[model samples]
Every structure is written in structure tokens, then in C-alpha cells.
Target: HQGVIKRNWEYINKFDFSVMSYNILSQDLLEDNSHLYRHCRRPVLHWSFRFPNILKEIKHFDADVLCLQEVQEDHYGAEIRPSLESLGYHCEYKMRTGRKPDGCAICFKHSKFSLLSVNPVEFFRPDISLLDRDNVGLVLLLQPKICPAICVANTHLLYNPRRGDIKLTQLAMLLAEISSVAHQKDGSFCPIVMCGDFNSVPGSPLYSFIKEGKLNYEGLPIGKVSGQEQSSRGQRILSIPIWPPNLGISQNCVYEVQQVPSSNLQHHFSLSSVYSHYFPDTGIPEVTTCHSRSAITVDYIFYSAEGGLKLLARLSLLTEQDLWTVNGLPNENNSSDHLPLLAKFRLEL
Candidate 1:
């Protein structure tokens, strides 16, 4: 029962920093030959069901930085950067290099941070020479007004669970590149926070490698353990926990709310109960539920070894309607099947 939901607002507000992440729902790819005539299908429709809900969630949390995945570039004609910019957010996106339809993007609100740079990392095998373009991963650099400049890499890795070994190797390579940049004597190494839909569970091997201090093939240590267990190598590595669920609600009610096809239904339920419990009413939308899962954790945020960032809060899976019931049905016509994950943090002063 003890959670951010019951904590005093003043106490929680003390943190100097915070971040929000979501897999913004995507539009379906048009495959039929009739798609040419159906050009009337604006790309926004692909995201229409989910964008407002995600926006409401961000407003509610008032996070300094927001990382979004599965954002469509084809439909929007450009990346999500412009739209977010209109909302007073600066954003950067990695191009869709391969078979993926939408790309990943990072958005930052104007008051808390400024953008430094954004880079795309290629992880797939370049030698294969297949027509399928591998999706490019994004690394966004930012200078936070309250903390040291930092790098935030947002990515949606390949979904093959069996290829965890390969994915982890690729991830390690990417991390090493960032670590090298951040740890330079030239004062180049910035604190880093890597967040996104990893498609790997906390217990998966991919997660283990990142949790460990080794970021490169040379075994360069990037993360330093902060607690008393720092001396013990075994204890220094810790598994980040997913947010706990709400109590007293029936499991079936939770499931139905998550599975409801109508986006309106999902939002109404979430605004009334789920999201309202965590964020101030004025900051959020009237509806909270976003995806189809009643309760699940398929997305995550992991800090770098050098950043010393501490997680402050996380939302339940069923808080936003776009996350729960955006497209049309349970497993048929919705946006991405994954749930959005939101977490706030405190940067070491």
C-alpha cells in the first residue's frame, strides 16, 4: 500500500529532476493496393488514438525530459520533433533506417533543459546487405539547468527474445561508445540515462549486462555503486524493480479497462482512478488509461554508472487510455501492444 500514491506532494516535489517515457502508439502500415487511393488516411490517424493520451500524461507528470518510441515519421511527414516543438518542447529523432515504420524520439520541455546533440547508432549486421534497413538507435545529449550535462539514448531494440545475446552485445557496443565520450579527460563525458522499450525483462541476460558495470569490450566500468554494497562486486549490481500495482481493485475490472476497444472508455477509467492518484489533477488529462494491458511493465528507464540518478516515481500500466485501448481491439487493431512506462528521477546535486 505504501507508494507514491499515498506520499505527501511536498515531499515528492523535493526532487531536482524527473523524466517520462512512453511508446507512443503507432499507426498501422498500409499494405493493400488500395492504399494509393486511401491517401486520405492521414498518418496522424495512426497516432491520433494515442498521442493525446501520451501528451496528457506528460503534462501531468511535468517531467523535464520525455523519451518516446514507435513515433511515425511517414505519417507526420517529418519526425515528432516539430509537433512537440509547438508544445514548447525541443526534440530529436533517430531516422528510420530499416524495416521499421516509425522511429524513436526524445522531447524536452524548455524550462528544465537544453539540447546539445543527437546521434544515430547502427546495431544490425551491415554485411548482410539485405533490403531491410535496420532501425537506427538514437542518442540525445542535453544540458540540464540543475545537473551536469548528460546524454539520454532512447531506443526500441529488435524484438527477438531468442536473440538476447546478440542484442546485448550490440547494446554493450553502443554503451561503450557513449562511455568513451562521457569519460574523456577533455571534460566531454556527460552523465547518461538510457531509456526505452527494450523488449527484455529485468531478469533477461540483456538487462544483466547493462546492470553490470562493464560497458565495453575492454571491460571499462561506467557505473559506480553508490550504497554500502559498493565494496562487494556481487552486491553492487542491482535489478531495477518495475512499479507495483494498485490495491483493492478487482483483477477483472483492471483487465477489462485495459482491454476496452474504445479509447474513450479507457481514458475515462484512468482519469477517474489510475492516473489521478499519482499526478495533480490540473497537470493531467481527464483520462489516464492508454494501452491494452490491465497491468504490465514492458518499457523501462536505466541510468548510467556515472550519472548517480535515483528513481523517484513510476505509474501503473493502466493509467493512460492510448496505452490500453487506442486502435480498435484487444489484439487486433490497436497501437503498439506494449504499455507505456513513466518514471521520475532526482539528479545528484
Candidate 2:
């Protein structure tokens, strides 16, 4: 196994730290979607085969902060949390609502930062159909020893390719939590590092919204936003008012709005992607997740663009050809369908 494809320790300075975003496929979900991993040998799918591989991969990253999605609740309480805690990291997990057995986790090196506040977001709203998914997110406010506070959020959005509407609503809810956690007394905002398996590919409407800071989601086809759907669908266009006023989430993806009537979605943070979605040397498209049926890029690490943060470097991603040689993911070398993304950022302290 070629561990950690990049080594640039000299690129890191005094104010530098690293963040890793990964979607460790939950055991429950893997069994539920058994057909998706039919190519894998049966033994490789078992938790016994996957646990050590997953842990080893994470340990090798050695990132200061880790934002993980699809972490199983039972495994977290019994093994994962304790193991990481022994490694001198403070870990927090937020399980999904209802019957889902997995959730998201955010961990940081105890020596590097202290927790200020933690907000777990549940996208399951009984009143709204668009917000009924069991997917969830975790938002945290951390005070670095060297600098001021910053916001770090982790989430696993709904996986349905056709339900872009629900994905958008779920993301809005996560953003609302960030707005609350990162708010300051003097009207300033904390720098944000958001990580997730958004289930939306690059250049999709949802991806564009996060990177561009604004998106006219109005009139967009429900199936067109995530870019996951292969065929065209004239299913439905987003309504002028995508969500009801009483939902409390504003069009800007914040907690409250002062009677703004626009359905266009927007956010206050100017976020940029850590990965360019292509390999620099060969220009091959990067694939974060690869399974029996498909290989694609859905996981991401996004940071506030103008929020006093400078991206140093990111771990290089493997191309489809690279993964196919190893018989896709969950083979002898890899443990999950998705790969972890690690990036170093320098805080302008």
C-alpha cells in the first residue's frame, strides 16, 4: 500500500494545520446496499476486515482535524472513539435521527484546539417533505491555541440522486447551524472548514452554490442539481418559494430572514474547493468513491475563501485508472468505497 501519496512537511509553517474529510462507509449501509459491492470478496466486506484498514488509513493521514461521515454509532462508542481518544484527539459524534445507525464525526488534536461549542443538525423535519431524510451534520466551534475561533462542519447528505431538492434543504439546515455557531459579538464571522460526502459532483448546481456563494435555484429541475442522474428528467421545477416561511431557514441558508421573498439560495461564506477535481500531472478526473457499479467524486473539503485562510496543499487523489487496477475500492488495500481527502491550510495569524 502506497500510504499518503504526498509528503510536503516543509510546506507547513507555524500557523499551518491539516483537515481530512472522509466518508467511511457504514457497515449497516453496506449490507443494506449489498448489490453495490458485489464485486468485492465476501471476506473484505466484513467489519473484521475493514476496521484495521480504516483506522490505519486515518492514522497515516495525521491531520490535525478530521471530519468523518457515515460513522456507525455502535462502533464509535465501542471502538472508534476510544481508539482515537488514546491517540490524543478529542472526538465528537452525531448520529442520524430515526432508524439510521450511522452519523458524522469531528475530531481534533487536543493539543491544537479546544472546543467552544458543538451543534448537531438533524435534517428530519416532520412538517416538510423536502427535509424528511435521516441524514445529519455536525458543526463545531474550535479555539486554536495560536489564533481565534473557527468553524468546522461535517455532514453526510442524502444519497438519492433524484432528490436534489431534499439534498439542498439538508445542506441549508447544516449551513444554518454554522451561521449560529460561527456568529460573533462584533458582527464578524469565523473562518469555516466544511467537509462532507455531499453526493453532488463538481460543477453541479449544488456544488456551484457552495463555491459561488449564491445560486438561483428557482426554476431548476429537481433532477438537475446534483448531477448524479444520467438521463434527462423533466420531473419538476423548484417552486418560487422552495420552502415555507415557517421552516425558519432563510433563503440565505441562515437562521432567520427579515421578510425576504426570494427563493434564490445564498450563503454568507465564500467557500472554495480544496481539490481541483482533476489530477495536475495527467489531467485525469479524480474519483473519491469507487464501487462495483460506479466511480465518481462526491466527497469534498471546502474552506471559507476570504476568511483569513490560505490553502497550503492537499493530498493527491487517485484517478479511475489507478483505482481500477486494484479492483476498485474495498479490495485488499482499501477499506471503503470512498477515499479520505486531506488538505493543509495556513491561518493568517
Best by TM-score: 2
Clashes of 1: 18
lDDT, candidate 1, equals 0.48
Which predicted model would earn the best lDDT? Answer: 2
Compose the digit string of candidate 1's lDDT tens values, residues 1-349: 4222221233222235566667765564323222322322244344554455555555666667777877777754553565567777877766567666677878788777777766776665554322123555677777776546777777776544333333443454356445544453555455567777665543333444455432222221112211111232322122111101221112111211223231000100100001223235434332222222222334667764334555555554433433333342222332334444565666666
lDDT of 2 by residue, 8-98 (tens): 4323234678999988889999999999998888889998889899999888878899999889999899989998998889999999999
Error of 1 at 165 (Å): 3.9
Q: List the residue pairs that clash in candidate 2.
A: none
CA lDDT scores, all candidates in order: 0.48, 0.86
Model 2 stretches with alpha carbons more than 4 Å out:
1-14, 257-263
